Amino acid sequence: SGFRKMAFPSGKVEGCMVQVTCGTTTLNGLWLDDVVYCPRHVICTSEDMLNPNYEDLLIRKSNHNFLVQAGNVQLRVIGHSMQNCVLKLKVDTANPKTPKYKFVRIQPGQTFSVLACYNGSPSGVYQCAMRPNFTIKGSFLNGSCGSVGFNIDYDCVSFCYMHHMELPTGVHAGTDLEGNFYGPFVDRQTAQAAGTDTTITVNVLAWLYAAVINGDRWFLNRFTTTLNDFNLVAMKYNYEPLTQDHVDILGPLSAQTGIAVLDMCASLKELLQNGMNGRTILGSALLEDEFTPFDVVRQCS
Amino acid sequence: SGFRKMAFPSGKVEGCMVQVTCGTTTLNGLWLDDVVYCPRHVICTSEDMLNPNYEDLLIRKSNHNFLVQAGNVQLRVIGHSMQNCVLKLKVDTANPKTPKYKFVRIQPGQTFSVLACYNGSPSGVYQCAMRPNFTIKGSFLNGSCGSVGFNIDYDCVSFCYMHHMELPTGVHAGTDLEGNFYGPFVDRQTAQAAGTDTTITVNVLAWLYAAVINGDRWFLNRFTTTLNDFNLVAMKYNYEPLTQDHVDILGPLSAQTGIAVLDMCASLKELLQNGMNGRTILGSALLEDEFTPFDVVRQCS
Ligand SMILES: CC(C)(C)c1ccc(N(C(=O)C2C=NC(=O)NC2=O)[C@H](C(=O)NC2CCCCC2)c2cccnc2)cc1
Ligand SMILES: CC(C)(C)c1ccc(N(C(=O)C2C=NC(=O)NC2=O)[C@H](C(=O)NC2CCCCC2)c2cccnc2)cc1
Ligand SMILES: CC(C)(C)c1ccc(N(C(=O)C2C=NC(=O)NC2=O)[C@H](C(=O)NC2CCCCC2)c2cccnc2)cc1
Ligand SMILES: CC(C)(C)c1ccc(N(C(=O)C2C=NC(=O)NC2=O)[C@H](C(=O)NC2CCCCC2)c2cccnc2)cc1
Ligand code: NA
Ligand code: NA
């Protein structure tokens, strides 16, 4: 047993990470087949970044303007185009380490693994949820742009995130691999802020089931509630509404524990009102909301 | 910014993980060069669990009693020997993916990345610390034995842990890669229990410095403390003694933040007396002790 926040093994993705240099800017790119994907702001000087015309900046650019390096091997750029906020560099070499993959856009509340990278070199890996406000609470520094987020389902790597910027609250925003931002953000140096976040209700419940399955049971009670009443509780505490779909998705855990979702909701109601006040569940004094039901099942059975 | 329990990219280790089968028992082994390392308890039966005589059980084995798969490739065992609690199977194929590597025995408080594996197939990656009571708080199901923990500093993978068993309290015990258990544990089914655990004080201070580095100062105070007075107080909260070695180790973080180590110790004293009063530090409502001073500099730079 035990329950830990746990990333997918990153090896299939490490073999895809390259360094992309345009001018004085170096960041990371994703090398799949014979194309390298990276954030389009790689072409931007500091003054360009305040109000960039990417159409016209890229038009002033050429193939030789981009340096791509995989390990200590330079890949030659034979073409370049822009899709939304993502730059696509055609190289003269198909990545022989290209995994079975697809580009996927993840839903708020769902999790993925982040491979943090610097100068094309993988540095660390951790799990993130797509927050309801479309940010992720990552760990990224100078040079991490181009780092990617992914899931793995039977040797298929599903890429869902590319890192573009840090927000003033220290949370992070990026795009899917087709260059569409998650959230109302732009790849420009301008005043931007995360919206007030909310807590992913179904994930907190999934995590309470994980705590029960692992012997943590003190918060259980004989009481059950209704969706209508709880969701009124959820509003007061900036919790997402719980739908019938959410209750269904937790079906497995409710069966495994004999605690119905509305009965677990009654437990959740009680914790929201009183507060942790220092006491712990699964070694946390917060209600953790970045574990999905799948994440729990994949780990507690 | 951001601060996260961050694992090392697992790719270099995934290419070394194999499946070892003996009798009806299957677990994981570590394939480096022409040797596969695995827990020696792969050779016990249901009647050998309480007081196995490992030397006697091993002498009755032929090389072909051992089945080793790498992916779907069979490796042929051409030799075997036992070193402490680890079995070393020689195979006719040196692993072509063997990284630069080395075996290290770690001390309590040190962290490492765990690649959880089942049936030779890597499953997830997460961070652990060696607790002062020589267990680790992992996430392991049956079939995870032989999963390894490691650090990666400049392409050299240092292996420091191989998983052997779950203890009654849900925590985990294993050996270094020379087969010597961490702690007083034995690879027998006999009644064993972890000693009472304590908090890794040097790590909590490192993490407090990490919080300052990411711009949080609310928990500092105008007080200082002697090393001895801090220890007298901290051990009333089941914290490990802080030694001069620890103080020396925090020197670089002390310098980077401009907060003397004993001033930080005064802040920790107060946090233990007060709690968080509804605030958080780097996302947590408790005092986190599984980031080392080295991990902090790694992640914050
Ligand atoms: C395709 C070419 C021939 C261009 C190539 C192949 C391998 C490397 N890689 C080396 O390490 C080298 C091997 N031989 C050399 O001569 N130079 C190198 O750089 C990296 C590597 O395989 N990482 C593994 C990936 C699986 C998990 C563990 C780490 C690498 C691979 C892809 C992107 N980035 C880095 C570089 C280039
Ligand atoms: C606002 C200034 C100009 C100070 C800035 C610029 C770039 C960075 N970023 C870097 O990577 C750096 C590159 N060169 C440097 O010298 N310093 C850096 O920090 C990333 C990032 O926010 N980019 C966006 C891209 C869209 C427009 C706004 C910036 C970043 C940093 C930390 C964590 N995640 C991502 C940080 C700050
Ligand atoms: C050396 C031999 C020839 C014995 C070999 C080579 C490759 C495989 N591996 C396959 O996946 C296969 C490829 N071709 C096949 O025909 N059969 C396979 O199983 C796994 C693999 O490469 N993992 C990578 C490792 C770096 C991170 C990303 C994933 C693998 C490698 C080592 C241990 N265990 C599994 C199996 C065996
Ligand atoms: C004897 C009992 C029944 C108590 C037992 C046997 C094996 C396991 N272990 C398995 O992996 C299983 C294999 N076959 C099964 O049927 N159930 C299992 O749990 C691992 C483990 O503790 N081994 C030690 C090795 C030295 C001797 C004592 C056990 C394990 C399990 C969970 C997490 N980490 C490691 C757990 C318990
Ligand atoms: Na690379
Ligand atoms: Na394998």
DSSP A178-195: TSPBSSS--SSSS---PP
Chain breaks in chain B (C to N over 2.5 A) after: none
Is residue B244 classed exposed, middle or buried when 0-12, 13-18 and 19+ CB atoms within 10 A define those classes?
Answer: exposed
Say whether residue B141 is in contact with chain A using an 8 A CB cutoff.
yes
Tell me which residue of B224, B203, B114, B211 sits closest to B161, measured CA to CA: B114
Which of A8, A13, A14, A121 to mutate for ligand 1's pocket (most ligand atoms within 8 Å of CB)?
A14
d(CA B81, CA B128): 29
Kindly provide the resolution of this structure in angstroms, with one decimal. 1.7
Lookup result for tokens 């069979």: B74
d(CA A112, CA A114): 7
Task: Spell out the residues 6+ positions from residue A214 whose beta carbon is closer than 8 angstroms to its own.
Answer: A1, A2, A3, A282, A300, B170
- B-chain residue closest to A71, CA distance: B155
- Alpha-carbon separation of residue A181 from A28, A83, A160, A233, B183 (angstroms): 18, 12, 11, 32, 49
CATH entry 3.20.20.70 includes domain A1-14+100-197: no
Angle between helices B227-234 and B261-274 (to 10 degrees): 20
Is residue A69 classed exposed, middle or buried when 0-12, 13-18 and 19+ CB atoms within 10 A define those classes?
Answer: middle
CATH superfamily of A198-301: main proteinase (3clpro) structure, domain 3 (1.10.1840.10)
Task: Spell out the residues 6+ positions from residue A230 whose beta carbon is closer than 8 angstroms to its own.
Answer: A242, A262, A265, A266, A268, A269
d(CA A122, CA A147): 9
What are the boundaries of each domain within chain A? 1-14+100-197, 15-99, 198-301
Chain breaks in chain A (C to N over 2.5 A) after: none
- Kindly compute the dihedral angle of the four CA atoms of residues B261, B294, A117, A62, in this order, to the nearest 10 degrees: 70
Is residue B8 classed exposed, middle or buried when 0-12, 13-18 and 19+ CB atoms within 10 A define those classes?
Answer: buried
B64 φ, ψ (degrees, to nearest 5): -80, -5
- Alpha-carbon separation of residue A183 from A80, A111, A128, A164, B277 (angstroms): 26, 16, 15, 12, 32
Half-sphere exposure of B81 (CA within 13 A, CB side): 4
Nearest 5°: CA angle at B206, between B255 and B195?
145
Say whether residue A78 is in contact with chain B using an 8 A CB cutoff.
no
Task: Spell out the residues 6+ positions from residue A177 whose beta carbon is closer than 8 angstroms to its own.
Answer: A30, A37, A86, A103, A148, A159, A160, A161, A162
- Kindly compute the dihedral angle of the four CA atoms of residues B222, B228, B229, B233, in this order, to the nearest 10 degrees: 110
Amino acid at B275: G
Say whether residue A170 is in contact with chain B using an 8 A CB cutoff.
yes
E strands, A33-182, in order: 35-39, 66-70, 73-75, 77-83, 86-91, 101-103, 111-118, 121-129, 148-153, 156-166, 172-175
Elucidation technique = X-ray
C-alpha radius of gyration, chain A, whole number: 22
Tell me which residue of A136, A206, A8, A213 sits closest to B126, measured CA to CA: A8
Nearest 5°: CA angle at B11, between B6 and B17?
115
Bridge partner list, B119: none
Tell me which residue of B96, B154, B104 sits closest to B130, measured CA to CA: B104
H/E element, B273 = helix B261-274
Q: Is the Cβ–Cβ distance between A112 and A151 less than 8 Å?
A: yes
d(CA A293, CA A154): 19
H/E element, B151 = strand B148-153
* Residue B17: count of CB within 10 angstroms of its CB: 25
Would you state the structure tokens that stand for residue A71, as one six-digit string? 């390990």
CATH superfamily of A15-99: Trypsin-like serine proteases (2.40.10.10)
DSSP SS3 for B54? helix
Amino acid at A202: V
d(CA B110, CA B200): 10
Q: Which residues lie with the beta carbon below 6 Å from any ligand 3 atom?
A: A 11-12; B 11, 14-15, 17-18, 70-73, 96-97
Amino acid at B68: V
Length of chain A in terms of residues written: 301
Q: Is the Cβ–Cβ distance between A36 and A80 less than 8 Å?
A: no
d(CA B243, CA B286): 23
End-to-end Cα spacing for chain B: 10
Tell me which residue of A175, A181, A186 sits closest to A54, measured CA to CA: A186
Establish whether domains B1-14+100-197 and B15-99 are of one fold. Answer: yes
Q: Is the Cβ–Cβ distance between A272 and A219 less than 8 Å?
A: no
d(CA B127, CA A89): 35
